[PDB]
Amino acid sequence: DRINTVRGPITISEVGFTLTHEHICGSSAGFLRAWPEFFGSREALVEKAVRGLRRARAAGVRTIVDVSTFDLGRDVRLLAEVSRAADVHIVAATGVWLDPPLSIRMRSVEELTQFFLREIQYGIEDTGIRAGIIKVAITGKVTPFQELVLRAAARASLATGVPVITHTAGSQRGGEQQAAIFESEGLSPSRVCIGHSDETDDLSYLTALAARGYLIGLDRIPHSAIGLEDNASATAFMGSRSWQTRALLIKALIDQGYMKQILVSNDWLFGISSYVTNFMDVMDSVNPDGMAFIPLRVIPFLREKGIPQETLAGITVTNPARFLSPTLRA
């Protein structure tokens, strides 16, 4: 079976150790093309990303999933360039994030479904690169527009077998909202990762979703504004919980018997224009390991806590391949 990447299809055996929720750059549609100097230059951004991916590769990573949507400024040509240079597979995304422009947010559920299908079945822009995942997002109480996006995502997943990754901004729960909508459309929970789940400490909430068959994205592990009391922007974006506390949720879910439902990532990037200026510097100061943080810090931490190799490989290799492999029915 085959997974689409920015350099073409690859087999399941080629996927390897995967980071399921990452970005090369967090931006806005067309922004990198219109003002590349915001990032120093396109060339500087490419250099920062290639070095960062090569560090991750040296720590064991073989694939990342860039869950940047059109409205997060996804540039698949950038992804292809850095994937080739770093020799790390990149899966690209369709879907809608938090900042849809009018041309997206004025659209109907049917139109959004056709847009997602175009990006998965035909390709992104004029590149022939096909999305391998659908990324959606909601705020607090799912808005009428976000509900349209979720339903369109479920429909595109049902037609193509590609999985859906979702999260709730602003609050620590919210996965129940998305689950009810997805299920109303007939989508299998095994096609869905409820992301940014490490933002809550409510284990009962995560375990119940896992028991229903949802994948649980513990994918903002290195985000933390501890020590950055000076910075309101940093606390608002990364939060005030230690990375070890977040990582321990991984062990907790394993102990509950749901290793098979866990996906782990960094939610990192190599440039960011969608927040305050120079926020990349703040992030880099918190986590100098970048995307290598999971393999260099979290994996050893879990081992020390007594999680066996084979379990860690199940989480980092087996689960992502099962998740990404397009699967029409469960």
Ligand X SMILES: C[As](C)(=O)[O-]
We find the least distance from the C-beta atom of residue 24 to ligand X, in angstroms, to be 11
**x/- binding map, residues 118-157, to its own copies, per CB under 8 A?**
xx----xxx-------------------------------
| Helix H or strand E segment including 19 | strand 18-22
Q: How far is the CB of 33 from its own copies (least distance, A)?
A: 5
The rounded distance, in Å, linking the Cα atoms of 130 and 22 is 17
Q: Is the dihedral of CA 163, 174, 289, 299 positive or negative?
A: negative
Residue identified by tokens 């590609």 is: 162
Q: Which of 102, 204, 329, 330 binds its own copies (CB under 8 A)?
A: 102
Task: Assess 26 for contact with ligand X (CB under 6 A).
Answer: yes
User: How far is it, in rounded angstroms, from Cα 296 to Cα 120?
Assistant: 33
Residues forming contacts to Zn ion in the complex (CB under 5 A) are 167, 267
* CA-to-CA separations, 285 to 78, 230, 290, 304, in angstroms, rounded: 24, 14, 10, 25
Closer residue to its own copies (CB): 265 or 273: 273
CB nearer to its own copies: pick between 205 and 275: 275
Selected from 61, 72, 91, 291, the binder of ligand X by CB under 6 A is 72
- Contacting residue, 79, 90, 104, 137, with its own copies by CB under 8 A: 104
Name which of residues 275 to 304 contact its own copies (CB under 8 A). Answer: 275-277
**Six-digit token string for 26:** 């967090």
Q: Quick one: 69 or 113, whose CB is closer to ligand X?
A: 69
* Of the candidates 160, 106, 104, the residue with the CA atom closest to the CA atom of residue 136: 104
At residue 295, φ and ψ (nearest 5 deg) are -70, -35
71 vs 199, beta carbon nearer its own copies: 71
CB of 304 to Zn ion, least distance (A): 27
Angle of helix 243-255 versus helix 203-211 axis, rounded to 10: 40
Residue 199 contacts which entry, Zn ion, ligand X, its own copies, none (Cβ below 5-8 A, type-dependent):
none
Specify whether the CB–CB gap between 89 and 317 falls below 8 A: no
Give the footprint of its own copies on this chain (CB under 8 A). Answer: 27-31, 33-35, 37-38, 70-71, 73, 99, 101-104, 106-108, 111, 114-115, 118-119, 124-126, 273-277
